[PDB]
Write a protein that binds this ligand. Structure first.
Ligand SMILES: Nc1nc2c(ncn2[C@@H]2O[C@H](COP(=O)(O)OP(=O)(O)OP(=O)(O)O)[C@@H](O)[C@H]2O)c(=O)[nH]1
Ligand SMILES: Nc1nc2c(ncn2[C@@H]2O[C@H](COP(=O)(O)OP(=O)(O)OP(=O)(O)O)[C@@H](O)[C@H]2O)c(=O)[nH]1
Ligand SMILES: Nc1nc2c(ncn2[C@@H]2O[C@H](COP(=O)(O)OP(=O)(O)O)[C@@H](O)[C@H]2O)c(=O)[nH]1
Ligand SMILES: Nc1nc2c(ncn2[C@@H]2O[C@H](COP(=O)(O)OP(=O)(O)O)[C@@H](O)[C@H]2O)c(=O)[nH]1
Ligand SMILES: [Mg+2]
Ligand SMILES: [Mg+2]
Lengths: 436, 48, 426, 50, 48, 426, 427
């Protein structure tokens, strides 16, 4: 059981840099691809053969691609802490950047590099045996994670097809944002993110900032703070393929029974217990408490209030010393609760899943080591609010034909500016149609 | 038994309408204090 | 000399079987390594029903193990009494179940069951006189519910005469640990009713309630639930392995417990279940065992038997016992409440005795009842299926893998007519 | 947001009150039935004594 | 001014909802109390 | 063959019963562990009236503790001789009645009574021939008065041909410890006169006076009061466990004592009670035992029998003795004090002998009188009840919890006619 | 079984500091919060030997809330149970009830909710405040109303510090108290009274401290609280909890105001010389000078009493002392209580704080009584509030805040009704 990951755009490489950091130490691999010779701590030898592949002399290499157009951020990895870890072929960087222009990153510049990217993907997958699926990290509000990413998505769907695609995509928050053309660069990529990404787990930066300030107590967080809990979530939801447990739920079961219709796949992610290093010992962290905290409206990686929506399905991947009784009792109390609702056609809402490995915390990190943890990946109906507000702020800019020349001169037309508009409209209509 | 039950119910409801004498006023007082505090959002005491 | 063959499928099936072989092996006295180091010579006499001597006393249990991922065979081999299973009996796939009955029963079924029938047929030839088959699997999963069901179809197609015990766990509202239980429950029960001979239906809420009330446990877990299921599965075959005052073979159980060929969904319970705190206070006597049996709090399934009518029942007993006291208890309990049994059957309760109680006790029993209050078990899943299927929920995972909605409608119809039959016989 | 949460919680409290009221109504109906059948039994006892 | 009017209206509606809930909850409380009194009288009668 | 099940209500009942079992287990010769280690066989010969054999010489008492707190049960278990009890009998809530009759009879009583009747039914079914129950409780609390009353009424609606020995520690004013004793005592005696069949009146005032005067103790804690009450309770019922020249069991005592269908309120004594200094300077002759037994400063009641006539009396002697000596002693007593005896009953006194005395004491006796002085305690509590109730003090704690005003007045009337019947017959 | 503690304002959190200082050494927990079945009422076991309490210290002026964080108990509490605002209510009921108060009560509820959630056998709430101030009165009333409308079915014990007749810090604390009377008359279930003049006189006589400060009062109040809750925490010969306390000490819905008296307050130099018998300490508890509240009991008739004994006490001497008291004539128990004592006996002697002002005494008594002499306190406060309110002095501060003349008028009328109710029920 193996999965090969692809990172695109500034967010892609940064989340990769703060995610493989967690992966290597969770599997106890030194930053030069060598397990310690004298001591060793791990569940088994075949635990790391899902992310890192050994090659002869005990020199593991990750199953990652870092592809980007600008070299100014790939060089950071090339000269950073893990230079020897990644071997030079898994690091693809173009000559110049895409610069927030979806068309520029999609058609002209991305053409020269997508074939190289997929030609490395194939010679990475051939060595693989139990290829579970493809996990992708990108920021849709950009010129590389949107354009090149949405080109590679089609160029992989044409090559493999029915394989599971877990795309963890970052949209702009309504308030906090770092661009002007992000509504265009988001809706245009959404039009093709709907039709190819099988499970699009949505993220947001304001929501993670609020989580970090509220729980972790840090008043001035940053990307090095956000990407750490992003890595925490990805490890929490991927650890079932790696570390055993009573109730195991892998990527197949996850992707299989959280998507009720072939187009309603838009998850909200949440992680509990997010707690600092000065309250963890003062808090008795029981299964019921962490479950309620995970289901709190004020703890979501997307800034959407679910009280306006209904949980179509839920999937709780627990970790660590969790006995499979209190989890059942807690989900029973959740069903009994009437603040949060379900939908009338899904009387069985939850996937419990339990892994027997406690969370692993980076030394010199803001997150404290704890016995247990839980990741909630719920399919809801309030994401229509997110898409509605995005479109509402898109209309105010498109009605003036603003910034359109930067696209049309790059080569595109208004046909897709209208097509993405109507496709997002149909997406919203489907959401409020199924919600009833 | 029916008469006794009804007597108990009516006496208790009278004792609680005694309390509801203290909720109706708290409605009108809050309404009146809210209609006026709405006009002091600009200048709370300089307008005085 | 009457051989029994055990078939394990699904993760739950593999765990339950790895505990059942635990209990059976320790009570016949074979140590973990695989040799025989018992104490009494009465256990040696019937080890052929479950074991084969290969060479040098390394007994190999007569079991088939099947799944779709190696992540369950790893646990099976790791667990205690793991080395006993013959390495040839680990037919495993490479893909995984996926919780889809389509992958369980149509796609992966073709390339897995055709490969495991070789092992099961070789085992049948290796043993001499098959009494029947006992299969422990799941109904809420992908391997046990679908692939196990298709294997049931193939085995019954091959051997028509042999009986079949189907130890099947079913989903439940309060302990619904997944979200497509109704589909994989209906699509399995439709074949189970037609094809099996004794459906031993279990669940998880009943076992948790037992481990909380009767066993007074603090943190019950799958180990304890599987231990209880193992105790029942050993009690059901106590008679073939040990002599007694009145033997009871599997065909005898079926004959005394089935009044109609498709009315064969029993409900089972164990006795005695006492807490370690108050072990030394109760009295292991037949009246106490029967009182603990005949009540809803001990049945190992989410059924309220007093909300129905026991059509028939059977009671296996073990220990140096008096059939006089046994059957006076079985008659007094029958005559106290004539309403809860059916009108047109005299002597609704069969009894049987064996002279060797299980290890660690001195006096035990096992109650297997064919009731009509078990219809509500399937009624819950049927109403869930109606509500979910009316809006085609999750249906594409099935209708994109060579399946038609006609299958769903007919499975629902079969469940409806079965539950109608139970309701009618009241 | 506060008004939305308030309305939800009020509706929940309402359905709770009707839940407990239905429980009480069922119990009282059971009791009335038991009382009348006990009167029937006392009449039968008088007949047996006679 | 428009924003203040909206906020003021929302506050009034919140407080009125709270007070009406308090009233209705007390009403169901006394109704259930009467049902309970009828219950206990019935129990003592049936026991005798 | 005859059976007694013992129930303990409230903290007072639990402590009294714990000491009672500490006494009776020794009188039967079994140690706290539960394994017999005594000397003779006259002990074991009829211990089936209290104990049940569990597993090879482990005897468990037939008692049910019950209250609304876990702390009292924890104290009982932590104390000596508390191991013998079956943990299943330990039934309790968590909130606590809080000296509130409404809590102890209407809310918590209702929510625990269904559970407690299950265990009392289990004990009353495990036996063979019941003759009556024992209940130990107070009349000045919530868990003891209201809950015990509800329990005994629920028993009467189930076993309408059996007696109950309800040992009621009446709330004495000079030993009162809570502000509302009468609001519990009156409302408890209301149904005590209706349902319970032998109410044994006891009072901490008389117990403390006995300890101060006769025993000459310096620091009498509740231990010695419970010791005296347990000695009385164990002596009243030795006519079953032990063979005597003239045997008289519970029904015989009841029919001998109770002349009219509602005058069951017994005032009780015990002999011989001595200080360990004067026990070396006295003679335990039968006339001396009788004189101490009729010594008015020895009855366990604050009502001096000199303030009324004796409806009847009964004496239970223990130890090899002379029956003629007993009869002539009681005849001399009656002839000398003929003014204290009802005129329309010839030979107002009953005598019985058992050939086994409580161990250590080579001779002993017990007194059960039905004197009309009992009206003193009831008028002395009715005065307080009326004095409080005139201005409805402390009344909202019950009215708000579900009791109308008319119930208190009806209780007043029942108490008044109860205290008036004794005056009428005096 | 648990009760959760809330501390509102200066006096509340200072008395709470004393109470938790006492509790940690009561149960053997080191101040850092680690032990080297009875603590369950106050602490809650967490971690590998950690015991955090069930207190919330909430106040507006941070200068005293953060004193706990700076102090030696920074590791004991949950770092967000110490709720601090940004600017005190400035002894202004209107400010602490309307302007600032409504922005912190939401967080107070959001914490007390999960406190109650981690609690299982909740017996009730106990709150500390001084209605002589602004926050302790206003925020106290608001939070108390919120708890009443949320839970309602759970009892509340409010240990209220009151303006003494002569020792008065502020000049508007009559206004603060008459404004808080509405909440303390219908939300708090049991309201315990504490004055400063009476405690000062007790310190001056019994303990012979010439110049006492706010540490002695806090210690002597923590002792009373500990004696009240020892029945729950430790074992006992004859126990009594909050439910019996209330069913024995609240004869009427609108009569709940207790007088407390601890005994024996004896220093270590006289502890050796005084043999301290049970009857002696009971008489010293009932004598009209060892009570914590300035109100002449002889100027009234007793209604009910509760006596919590701790230490080496047997239940015969308590009864003998009660009989002697009922035979005494200086105190007149009212007729509606032929019995008038809820006597409870415990088994854990008092615990001495190091560097404290009390000795290791084998036995101790805490008396809590309901009488009719508190109408004197209410009447004096009403007159001394009317004196100021005739000229409407200082009212303009509350009016400018937003509070109108209404709540003043209704508060005065509620005091009048309360006074008449005590005077009438006295007969
Ligand atoms: N929350 C979070 N967001 C990030 C992080 N790194 C990058 N982003 C997002 O990415 C945006 C930066 O531009 P990108 O969308 O990545 O553009 P690109 O994919 O690098 O392509 P170019 O525009 O050509 O550089 C920011 O607005 C962020 O919202 C990160 O570490 N955490
Ligand atoms: N017993 C006791 N009383 C105290 C202590 N500290 C302050 N007080 C009382 O607090 C009363 C005045 O209240 P404030 O000074 O206004 O404090 P507050 O009640 O919290 O009100 P704010 O200052 O507005 O927060 C005085 O009468 C003191 O008696 C203390 O440590 N012990
Ligand atoms: N009682 C009990 N139930 C189990 C145990 N293990 C798993 N289960 C449940 O039984 C079902 C078995 O189906 P599943 O494990 O998904 O089958 P598979 O994954 O295809 O092999 C699961 O949904 C579990 O909820 C066990 O040890 N005891
Ligand atoms: N003999 C005896 N009497 C006790 C003991 N403890 C309390 N009492 C008496 O019992 C009465 C209280 O009854 P209680 O058990 O508390 O009833 P409850 O309030 O419903 O729990 C008091 O009047 C005490 O005099 C004890 O240990 N022994
Ligand atoms: Mg870029
Ligand atoms: Mg202050």
């Amino acid at each position: 059981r193996e999965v090969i990951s692809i990172h695109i755009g500034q967010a892609g490489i940064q989340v990769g840099n703060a995610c493989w950091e967690l992966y290597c130490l969770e599997h106890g691999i030194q930053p030069d691809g060598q397990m310690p010779s004298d001591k060793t701590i791990g569940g088994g030898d075949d635990a790391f053969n899902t992310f890192f592949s050994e090659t002869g002399a005990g020199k593991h290499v990750p199953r990652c691609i870092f592809l980007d157009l600008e070299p100014t951020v790939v060089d950071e990895v090339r000269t950073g802490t893990y230079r020897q870890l990644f071997h030079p072929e898994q690091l693809i960087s173009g000559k110049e950047d895409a610069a927030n222009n979806f068309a520029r990153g999609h058609y002209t510049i991305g053409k020269e590099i997508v074939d190289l990217a997929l030609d490395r993907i194939r010679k990475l997958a051939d060595n693989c045996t139990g290829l579970q699926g493809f996990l992708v990290f990108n920021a849709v509000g950009g010129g590389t994670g949107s354009g090149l990413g949405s080109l590679l998505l089609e160029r992989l769907s044409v090559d493999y097809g029915k394989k599971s695609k877990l795309g963890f995509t970052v949209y702009p928050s309504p308030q906090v944002s770092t661009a002007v053309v992000e509504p265009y660069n988001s809706v245009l990529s959404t039009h093709s993110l709907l039709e190819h990404t099988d499970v699009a787990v949505m993220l947001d930066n304001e929501a993670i900032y609020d989580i970090c300030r509220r729980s972790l107590d840090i008043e001035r967080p940053t990307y090095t703070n956000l990407n750490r809990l992003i890595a925490q979530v990805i490890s929490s939801l991927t650890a079932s393929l790696r570390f055993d447990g009573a109730l195991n739920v892998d990527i197949t079961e996850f992707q299989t029974n959280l998507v009720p219709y072939p187009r309603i796949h838009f998850m909200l992610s949440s992680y509990a217990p997010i707690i600092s290093a000065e309250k963890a010992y003062h808090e008795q962290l029981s299964v019921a408490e962490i479950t309620n905290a995970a289901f709190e409206p004020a703890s979501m990686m997307v800034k959407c209030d679910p009280r306006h929506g209904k949980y179509m399905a839920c999937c709780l991947m627990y970790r660590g010393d969790v006995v499979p009784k209190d989890v059942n009792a807690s989900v029973a109390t959740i069903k009994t609760k009437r603040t949060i609702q379900f939908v009338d056609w899904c009387p069985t809402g939850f996937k419990c899943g339990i892994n027997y490995q406690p969370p692993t915390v980076v030394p010199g990190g803001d997150l404290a080591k704890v016995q247990r943890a839980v990741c909630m990946i719920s399919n809801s109906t309030a994401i229509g609010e997110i898409f509605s507000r995005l479109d509402h702020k898109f209309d105010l800019m498109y009605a003036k034909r603003a910034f359109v020349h930067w696209y049309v001169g790059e080569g595109m037309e208004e046909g897709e500016f209208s097509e993405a508009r109507e496709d997002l409209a149909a997406l919203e209509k489907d959401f409020e149609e199924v919600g009833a | 038994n029916r008469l006794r039950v009804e007597a108990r119910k009516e006496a208790m409801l009278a004792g609680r309408a005694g309390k509801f004498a203290d909720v109706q006023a708290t409605r009108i007082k809050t309404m009146r204090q809210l209609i006026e505090n709405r006009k002091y959002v600009e200048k709370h005491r300089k307008l005085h | 000399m009457r051989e029994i063959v055990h078939i394990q499928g699904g993760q739950c099936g593999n765990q339950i079987g790895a505990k059942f072989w635990e209990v059976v092996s320790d009570e016949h006295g074979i140590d973990p390594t695989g040799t025989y180091h018992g104490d009494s010579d009465l256990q040696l006499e019937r080890i052929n029903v479950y074991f084969n001597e290969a060479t040098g006393g390394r007994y190999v249990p007569r079991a088939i193990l099947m799944d779709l991922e190696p992540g369950t065979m790893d646990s099976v081999r790791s667990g205690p009494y793991g080395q006993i299973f013959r390495p040839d009996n680990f037919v495993f796939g490479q893909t995984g179940a996926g919780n889809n009955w389509a992958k369980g029963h149509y796609t992966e079924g073709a390339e897995l069951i055709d490969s495991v029938l070789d092992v099961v047929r070789k085992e049948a030839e290796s043993c001499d006189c098959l009494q029947g088959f006992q299969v422990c699997h799941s109904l809420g999963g992908g391997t046990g519910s679908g692939m196990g069901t298709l294997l049931i179809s193939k085995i019954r197609e091959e051997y028509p005469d042999r009986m079949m015990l189907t130890f099947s766990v079913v989903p439940s509202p309060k302990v619904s640990d997944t979200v497509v239980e109704p589909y994989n429950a209906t699509l399995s029960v439709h074949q189970l009713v037609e094809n099996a001979d004794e459906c031993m239906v279990l669940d998880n809420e009943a076992l948790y309630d037992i481990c909380f009330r009767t066993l007074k446990l603090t943190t019950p877990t799958f180990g304890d639930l599987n231990h209880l299921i193992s105790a029942v599965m050993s009690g059901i075959t106590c008679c073939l392995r040990f002599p007694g005052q009145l033997n009871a073979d599997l065909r005898k159980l079926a004959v005394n417990l089935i009044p109609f060929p498709r009315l064969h969904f029993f409900m089972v319970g164990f006795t005695p279940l006492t807490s370690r705190g108050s072990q030394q206070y109760r009295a292991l006597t037949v009246p106490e065992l029967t009182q603990q049996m005949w009540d809803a709090k001990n049945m190992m399934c989410a059924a309220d038997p007093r909300h129905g009518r026991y059509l028939t029942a059977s009671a296996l007993f073990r220990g140096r016992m008096s059939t006089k006291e046994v059957d006076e208890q079985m008659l007094n309990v029958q005559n106290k409440n004539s309403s809860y049994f059916v009108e047109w059957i005299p002597n609704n309760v069969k009894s049987s005795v064996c002279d060797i109680p299980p290890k660690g006790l001195k006096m035990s029993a096992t109650f297997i009842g064919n009731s009509t209050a078990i219809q509500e078990m399937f009624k819950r899943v049927s109403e869930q299926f109606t509500a979910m299927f009316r809006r085609k929920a999750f249906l594409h995972w099935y209708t994109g893998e060579g399946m038609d909605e006609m299958e769903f409608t007919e499975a629902e119809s079969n469940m409806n007519d079965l539950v109608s039959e139970y309701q009618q016989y009241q | 947001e506060d008004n939305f949460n308030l309305e939800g919680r009020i509706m929940g409290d309402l359905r709770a009150m009707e839940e407990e009221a239905a429980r009480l109504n069922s119990q009282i109906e059971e009791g009335r039935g038991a009382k009348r059948d006990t009167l029937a039994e006392i009449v039968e006892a008088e007949r047996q004594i006679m | 001014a428009a924003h203040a009017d909206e906020v003021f209206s929302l506050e009034n509606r919140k407080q009125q909802l709270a007070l009406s809930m308090e009233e209705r909850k007390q009403e169901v409380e006394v109704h259930r109390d009467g049902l309970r009194a009828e219950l206990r009288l019935l129990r003592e009668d049936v026991h005798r």
